[PDB]
Assembly symmetry: D2
Homo-oligomer: 279 residues x 4
Amino acid sequence: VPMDYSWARELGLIRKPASFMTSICDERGQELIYAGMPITEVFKEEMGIGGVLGLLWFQKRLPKYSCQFIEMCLMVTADHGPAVSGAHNTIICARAGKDLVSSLTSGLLTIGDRFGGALDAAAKMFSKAFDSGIIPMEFVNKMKKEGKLIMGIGHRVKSINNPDMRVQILKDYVRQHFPATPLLDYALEVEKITTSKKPNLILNVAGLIGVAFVDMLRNCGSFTREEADEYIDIGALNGIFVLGRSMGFIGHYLDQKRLKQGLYRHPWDDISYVLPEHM
Amino acid sequence: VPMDYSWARELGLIRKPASFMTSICDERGQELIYAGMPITEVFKEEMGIGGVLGLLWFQKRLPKYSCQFIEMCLMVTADHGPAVSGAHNTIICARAGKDLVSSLTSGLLTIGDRFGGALDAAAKMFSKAFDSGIIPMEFVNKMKKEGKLIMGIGHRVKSINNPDMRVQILKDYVRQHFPATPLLDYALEVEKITTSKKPNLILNVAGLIGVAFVDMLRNCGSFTREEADEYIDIGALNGIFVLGRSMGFIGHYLDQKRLKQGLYRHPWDDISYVLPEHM
Amino acid sequence: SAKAISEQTGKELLYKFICTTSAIQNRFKYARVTPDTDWARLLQDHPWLLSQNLVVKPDQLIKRRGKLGLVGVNLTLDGVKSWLKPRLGQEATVGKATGFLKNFLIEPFVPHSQAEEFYVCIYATREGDYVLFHHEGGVDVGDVDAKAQKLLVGVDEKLNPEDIKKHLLVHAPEDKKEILASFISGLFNFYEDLYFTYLEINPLVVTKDGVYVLDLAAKVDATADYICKVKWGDIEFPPPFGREAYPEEAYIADLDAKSGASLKLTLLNPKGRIWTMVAGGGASVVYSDTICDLGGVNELANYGEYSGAPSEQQTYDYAKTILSLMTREKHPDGKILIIGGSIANFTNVAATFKGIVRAIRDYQGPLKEHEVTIFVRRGGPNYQEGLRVMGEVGKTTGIPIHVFGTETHMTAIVGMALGHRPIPGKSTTLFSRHTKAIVWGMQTRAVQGMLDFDYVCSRDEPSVAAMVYPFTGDHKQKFYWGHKEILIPVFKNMADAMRKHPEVDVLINFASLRSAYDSTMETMNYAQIRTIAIIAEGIPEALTRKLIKKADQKGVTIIGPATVGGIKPGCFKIGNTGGMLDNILASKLYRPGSVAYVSRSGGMSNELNNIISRTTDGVYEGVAIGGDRYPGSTFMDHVLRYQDTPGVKMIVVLGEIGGTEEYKICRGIKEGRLTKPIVCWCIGTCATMFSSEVQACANQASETAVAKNQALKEAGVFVPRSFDELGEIIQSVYEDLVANGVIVPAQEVPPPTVPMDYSWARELGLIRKPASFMTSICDERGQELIYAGMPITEVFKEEMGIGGVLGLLWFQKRLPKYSCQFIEMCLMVTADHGPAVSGAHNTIICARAGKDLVSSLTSGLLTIGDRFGGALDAAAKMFSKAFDSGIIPMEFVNKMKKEGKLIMGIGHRVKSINNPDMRVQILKDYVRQHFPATPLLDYALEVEKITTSKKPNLILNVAGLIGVAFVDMLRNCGSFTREEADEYIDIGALNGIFVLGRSMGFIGHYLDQKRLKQGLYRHPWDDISYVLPEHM
Amino acid sequence: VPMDYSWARELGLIRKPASFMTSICDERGQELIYAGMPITEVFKEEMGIGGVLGLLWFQKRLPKYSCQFIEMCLMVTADHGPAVSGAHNTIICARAGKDLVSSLTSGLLTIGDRFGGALDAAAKMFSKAFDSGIIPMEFVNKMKKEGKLIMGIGHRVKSINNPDMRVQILKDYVRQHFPATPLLDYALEVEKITTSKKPNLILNVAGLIGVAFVDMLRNCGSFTREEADEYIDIGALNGIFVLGRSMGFIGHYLDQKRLKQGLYRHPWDDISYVLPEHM
Ligand SMILES: CC(C)(COP(=O)(O)OP(=O)(O)OC[C@H]1O[C@@H](n2cnc3c(N)ncnc32)[C@H](O)[C@@H]1OP(=O)(O)O)[C@@H](O)C(=O)NCCC(=O)NCCS
Ligand SMILES: CC(C)(COP(=O)(O)OP(=O)(O)OC[C@H]1O[C@@H](n2cnc3c(N)ncnc32)[C@H](O)[C@@H]1OP(=O)(O)O)[C@@H](O)C(=O)NCCC(=O)NCCS
Ligand SMILES: CC(C)(COP(=O)(O)OP(=O)(O)OC[C@H]1O[C@@H](n2cnc3c(N)ncnc32)[C@H](O)[C@@H]1OP(=O)(O)O)[C@@H](O)C(=O)NCCC(=O)NCCS
Ligand SMILES: Nc1ncnc2c1ncn2[C@@H]1O[C@H](COP(=O)(O)OP(=O)(O)O)[C@@H](O)[C@H]1O
C-alpha cells in the first residue's frame, strides 16, 4: 500500500511546504489564542472589544486607554443615518428580500474613496504634512496650490461656538488619556487656520479620528515608527470605519426587515434618460 | 534529509487525498478543455457563447437551437433600466468611486427572491403544476386558493392586442425550433385563463424564459428527466438571469463613470424618520 | 345580464345535461338548415330523418309561430324542401320588426293530440324560482300567469318531488303525474345547474313512449359563463328577430369582452343627423330621452355608451367606429355629434378624450364635407385638461366644436344642438362621522381618496381602519392624512383584521365578479359588519340572490353589486364615489345638506350630486344601488331610511325603466308611510316608441318609465316634465321648504385644505424637481425595451448577438459584425481557466459552504483585480502608452527592463515556440482576417519577437493579445474617436470584459459543486504556518 | 417660472410620499441620535459598544449586563483561525492584491448555513423545542427520529472534564448576571443527555450563545415575547456572528498584507479532475 501522507508527516519522512501563513489566531491547541494571548487571559485581563481588536489587527497588547479609544472610534462611526451611499445600498438590498450578509456586503462595497475613506485619507494627508517640516500655514498653502481640499476639515453646519459633539468627546478623551498628541496638535493648528477662513472648516470626525489614531499608533509604546506607518499604509483605519459602520448597516437591515418594507423601485421622474437617437 | 512530497508523489510512494473535485474545465494540459471539448474544437464547431455556457454549466454539447436560445435569453435579460434594485445599487456604488467589480457585485447581491428570481420561481411553479396531473384551470384555482400569485404572469402595461416584444420573439423562436414544448403549452393555457380574468395578466418574460428553459432541458435530448430537474433545482436559471443582467450592470457602471457622476446621497425629504422618543 | 339562447342550443343542453329516471326520446335528434347549407351532407351525417315524418320551425327567437304560419306540421322530406323555398331567404314580417330568415330547425314529427300537451315554465325572480305547470299546454294557453299551477322554490333550497305531487301536479292523470314528477325535478335541477334564468317547454308531450320536448324557449345568465363554460362549450346568443347588427355595430360587441369597460352601441338609422357618444349608461339614456323630447323621434341615428373607465385604445376604437358610421352618407341639412355624459367617478376624462381628439384629428378628410357640429359636455377626473385639449384640437382642425363643463346643465347641450336655445334588523343609519370600514382588496387610490374626503370633512379619524389582501403578508401601507403620513394595516386574512378592529362596521368589497360572492359570504359571518358595499360588476344573479337572502337573515345592508357605492357628505364615502377631491369641493360634498337621493347609475348619482349642490343647500346622503338585476338594497329600503332620518328634509329618486319599485314608493306614500317631499324621475321614457332596446328589461306597459312617471305624478311625487326640469323642480321644492321654515340652511364653513399631489403638479408643470440620476444605456419606460437608442426588436432583427448587445449597453454604439464576433470570442476564451485560480477557488469554497449562486459568484469575482484578472487592462494600458509615444518596441522592452517592470501580456508557462497558445492563435487569426487595421497588435508582435528572442516562452499572452486587439478594435472600427477609445480603456472596459467572461466559468463551478454535493471545506492545518507572537 | 420643489414643500403646497422609513439613526438634527438617544448621552451613560449595538439593532436601552454579554459574544466569535471558509476566502482575496473591503466581503459571503449559521440554527432549534413543551429527552429523541443533529451540541476535542473555555466564560457570566435563563437550563439538560452519550457532545459556543441570546431577549425586560421572536427570526444572531467575525477577517487581511504574501493558486495535486470524455 502507498505510504499515507499524514502518517508519513507524523514520522517526518516527507516535507510538503505550507502555502499559508497566519499570525493572529491559533485554534489548533487546547485553548483559543488571540495573537499569543489565551482567550481566558483575554477575558481575565478585562479586555474589551478594543483589546481583542488590538490583538487581532496589530498583534499587540495595547494599553487600556488605547483599547477604550478604539472602542469610542467604533462607537462614533457606528451609523450616520440612512441617506449615505452604504446605508442606502444596504436598505435597498434588505427591501429586496436578501439575507443579512448580502445586504451588509452590498452596503459595504460602496465604502472606498468617496464614501467612508475620509479617515484614512485624512490620516495620510496629516501624517505626510507633519513628517515633512512644513508648518500648518505652509500645509494649507500647499494644499491650496495642488487644488486639494484638506481631508478631515469642513462641516455642513458645525462651526466655532457650535462644535461637533462626537469630535468634542473624542478630542477630550484623547487629551486626558493620550500621553502625546503631536499630529493632533498639528491638526488643531490647521483647524485654527481654516476656521480663520470660512468657519465651518472645523476638524471633522474623520480627520480627528485619523490624526488621533496615528498618534495612538506612534505614541502608545507598542509600535515602532515603521510599524505604525505600515499599519496606516495597509488600511487599518479603513478597517476601523468598516467595522464601525457594519453595526449601523446591520441595524438598518434589521430595521427594514422589522418594518416589512417591500421591494424598492426608483421613480422614473428622478432619473434623466439621455439615450442616443439611433447609435 | 526528508523525502520531497512532490517527487515522492511522482515516485508514487505516498498518497494524499484530493480535497477538491471539478468537472467543467481542465487547464493542466497542452490545450484548454471545456468539459471534454478542446477550445480549438469549441471554436471549430462554430459554437458561440451558448455552446460554451452549455459545456461549462451542464457538461453537454447542446444543439445549435438550444445554444442560440440561451444567447437570446441572455440578450433579453441584459438590462431593464436603471430604476431596478440591482441597477440602482450598481449606480450608487459607481458614483461612490468604486471599481467595476465592487459596483457590479453590489448590484448583483440584490438579486434573489423579490428581484431577479422570477425566472426560477416561474419555472419551479409551472414544472410542479405540470408534473402533477392538474389541468391549467386547476392550477389557477389552486394558486388563487393558496394566496399565491402565479410567477411569470402579469405585465404593468402590456396585455392582449399589445404583446410583450421580448416574449413574442422568444416564443416565436421556441415554436420554430424546439421539437416539443409541453410546459410552454401548459403556460399558454394558464395565460389564456388569466387574460380572460384580466387583460394584463399575460405570460411574463420571466415565465416564458422559465418554461422554455425547462422545455429545452427536458426535450433537447442531452438531459434525462432527473438531470434537468436537478439543474432547475440547483439554480441554473438564477445563473442565466445573473449572467444576463451582469452585462447591463457593467454598462450602467461604465455609463456612470463616463458621465462622471458625483457621490450620491439620498434626499432627507424622501426618508421618513420614525425613531423612539427616548428608548 | 340574461340573454336568450336559440331553441337548438337549449335542446342540446337539455339532452346532454338532464338527469332523470324518466325516458326521453328524440335525444340529439334535430338538424339545422340554412340558406348556405349542404343538403346532401345533412342527409348523410344524420340520416335518421328518412323514416319518420318531420316538423320544421324557424329558430331565430320567434314567438307564437303557430299563429303566424311559419311552422309546418306533417311534412315529408320533399314537402319540407318545397315548403322551405317560399319563406327562407327573404322578408317574413313578425310583429313590429322585419328581417331575413337564415335559420330553420328540423325535428322528427310526433303523433299526439290536445289532451297530452303540457306546459312547463321555470323563471327566476328576486325571491327565487317560480315553476308553472299547466295541463292544457300547446299553442292554446293564452294568459298562463293566473291559470297554471304556480310554485315557488326559495333561494338555495331544493325542490322535493312531494311538493310537485301535492301542488304542481294536481290536474294530471296518475301515471302521467308520476312521470312528470320526476321529469320536472330533473328539469329544475338542469335549470339550476346551468344557471338558466328562464326556461319554457310548451308543449311538452307525455305519452306511453316517454317524454317529448318539442319547443323550448330559454334565457340564460351570460355573466355565469366563467362558471358554466365547460358545460356550455361555444354557446351563441342570437339577436332578436329583425335587422342584424352592422359590421361596425358588432365591433363594440367584441371590444366589450376585452376588458371590464362597458361599450354599447345600437344603430336605428344611419341616415340621421344626431349621433351620440355619451359616457355613462344612465347619461346616455337621459340624453336619448332629451333628444326625443324636443324633436328627435325620427331624427336620432344611434344610441350607446362607454363606461367602466375605458382605456385610450378602447375609446379611440369606439370614436373611430362611430365616426366611420357617421360619415357613410351626405345629409343636406348637416350632422350633429353629441359627446355628452355626467361627471365621472372613476373614468379618466383625459384618457377618454385624448382618444377622441386622436380619432377626430386623423379622420378629417371625409368628416368635413358633412358640416358636422360637435357639442361636448363632460366632467370627472382630469376633465378640465381633457376639455381644454379637445377644444384646442378642434380649433386647430377647424371643425366647429362647442365645449362646456359642469357649470352648465348636462342636457342643455342637446337644446343648443337643435337650436331651441342659444349657444354661448337593518339599520336606518348606515354611516356617521365615527364610521370605520375595512376595504377588501388592494385599492390604494380609492382608500387615499376616501382619506382625503374624510380630512376635508373635518373627521377626527380616517374612515379606513384596515385593508384585506390575501396575496401578501400582513404589513402597513403609508397613506396621507392631509399633509401627514399615516400607516393603515393590511391583513392577509379577514379574521385577523376583524379581530384587531372591532370598531369596524362597514366592508367595502373591491373583489372581482368571481370572488365577491365568497368574500361577502365570509364577511357576513361577522356580526360587527352591518353594511357591505359590493363594487364588482358581472356577478351571476343566483349568487346575488344568495347574498341577498343571507344579508336579510343577518340584517346586513348590501349596497348591491355593479355600483360606485354612495356618499354621505361630512360622514363617509364609499370607494371612488364623487371623483377626486376637486369634484368633492366643487359639489360641496364636504358638509351635510338636507336632500337625500337614491339612484341606480353611479355617474347619474354624481350628476345628481352636482345638480343638488347647485340648486340646493347640498346633499345629505346619496346611494347608488347599482345596475344589477337584483340589487342588494332596493329603492324602497333607502327611501324608508331617508324618511326615518330626521336630518333628511327632501328625497330625490332617479329611477329607471323596468320593475315596479316606483309603484312601491307610490303605495308607501298612499299609506302615509312616506311624508317628506319626494322628487322622482324615471329615465327611459324614450324606450316606448323605439324599435327595440337591450339596456331594466321591462315586460309590461306599467313598467315603462312614462307609466311610472305618470303614477308618481298622480301619487303625490313632484315629477318634473323631463330630466331638464329636474333641477328646477328640486330647487322649487327646496325654496318652498325654506319658506316654510323646515329647512334652515347652515352657514358655509371653508373645509381644511389638502396639499396638491407631487405627480399631479409635475403633470401640469407647476413645480420642478432636479433628477438625481442620469442614465444613457437603457430605456424601459416606453412600450418597447430600448438598448442605447435601439429597440429590442431591431436588436434581434439585425442579428447582433451578445456582442452587439454588449456594444450597445457598454459603448452606446452599433459596432460592425466582426467587432461583435470578436467581443463574443473574447468572452469565450476567458470563460474559465480551471478551478485552481483565486476567483474559481473562492467561488468553489462559497458553493461548498451552502451559499446561493449570487453569493458564491460575488465571492469569486471580488478577487478579480491587480494580481488576478487585471492582466487584460494592464497589458492594454502599457502597450497603448508605449505606442502613443514614439518609442520603438526595442526601446519599450529596454525601458520596462530598467524600470523593474515585467511586460504585461508577455510570458507563458509551457507554450513557448512551435507549440503556440491555441486561444492566442485563434484570436490573432480572427483579428488578422477581420480587423481593418491593427497597429497596436503589430507593435505587440514586434515586442513578442524581441521577448521570444530573449526567452522562448516570453510569448504574447491571451491577456496581452486581448488587450491590444481590443484597443485596436476601439481605435479602428470607426465607431469611436481617439478620446472615446482612451476613456473606455481608462474606465475599465476590459476589466468588464474579463469579469463577464469569467462569470460564466464561476457559475459553472458553482453548479458543478452543487451537482457533486461537495461538503463544507476546511483548509488543512498542516498547510498553514502558524507564526504567532510569543506574548504580544 | 416653475416653483421649486423644495420651496413648494416648505410652504406645504405639495405632498410627496417618502419612499424610505428608518428607525435607528437620525443625523439631520444638531446632534447625532441613536434610536432616540443623543451620542453625548450614549457616551455619558457609558453604554459601550454593546449599548450602541442594542440601540442600533433593537432600538432599546438594554441593561448593563446585557450590553456586556453582547460585547463578550462579539469577543468570543472574533476569530477561530485561518482554516475556516470565510477566513480562507478573505486570505485568498488579500493575497490577490484586493482592498480591505473586497477581501472582507469575500470572506463574509461564505457565512450562511454550513459556516457561521450555527448560532441562529441552535437558537431556533432550542426555542422551538422549549416553546413546544417537550422535555429535553423528548427533544433529543425527536431530533434523532428526524435525523437532525442538535445544533449547538458537539465539540471536536473538548468534552466532560475538559470543558470549552469560551463556553465556560460565557455560561459563568450568564449565570451570575442574567435574571432568568430557562432556555439555558433546557439546553444544559439536553447537554446532560448528550454527554451520557459521547463525552464530546457538549454545548458549543454556538448553542450556548444562541440560547443565552434568546434568554437575554426574553428576560432582560426590554422586549416582549413577540419582539424577541421577531428579532430571532429576522437574524439578529446572524448579525452578531457576522460582526464578531468581521474583526477576525479584517485582522487576517491585515496580517496577509503585513506578510506581503503573493498571489495564491491552488495545487493541481489537491484537485481531482473528472471531466466528460467528449460531451
Ligand atoms: C466635509 C464637507 C463635504 C462639508 O460639507 P458641505 O459641502 O459644507 O455640506 P454637506 O455636503 O454636508 O451638505 C450641504 C447641505 O446639504 C444638506 N444635506 C446633507 N445631507 C443631506 C441629505 N441626505 N438630504 C438632503 N440634504 C442634505 C446639509 O444639511 C447642508 O445644508 P446647508 O448647506 O443648507 O446648510 C467639505 O467641507 C469637505 O469636503 N471637506 C473635506 C473633508 C472631508 O472630506 N471629510 C469628510 C468627513 S465624513
Ligand atoms: C408582473 C407584475 C409585477 C406586474 O404587475 P403591476 O403591479 O401591474 O406592474 P408594476 O408594479 O410594474 O406597475 C405599477 C405601475 O407603476 C409604474 N411604474 C413601474 N416602474 C416604475 C418606476 N421605476 N418608476 C415609476 N413608476 C413605475 C408602471 O407604469 C405601472 O403602471 P401605472 O403607473 O400606470 O399603474 C405583477 O403582475 C406580478 O406581481 N406578477 C408576478 C409575476 C412576476 O413578478 N413576474 C416577473 C416579471 S418579468
Ligand atoms: C505569465 C507568467 C506568470 C508566466 O509565469 P511562469 O513562472 O512561467 O509560470 P506560472 O507562474 O504560470 O507557473 C509556473 C509553474 O507552476 C506550474 N503550475 C501552474 N499552475 C499550477 C497549479 N495550480 N498547481 C501546481 N503547479 C502549477 C506551471 O505548470 C509551471 O510549472 P513548471 O515549472 O513545471 O512548468 C509571467 O511570464 C509573467 O508574470 N508575465 C507578466 C505578464 C502577465 O502577467 N500576464 C498574465 C498571464 S495571462
Ligand atoms: N315534433 C312535433 N311533433 C308534432 N307536433 C309538433 C312538433 N313540434 C311542434 N308541433 C306542433 O306545432 C304547434 C306549434 O309549434 P311550436 O313551435 O311549439 O309553437 P310556438 O312557437 O307558438 O310555441 C304546437 O302546438 C305543436 O303541437
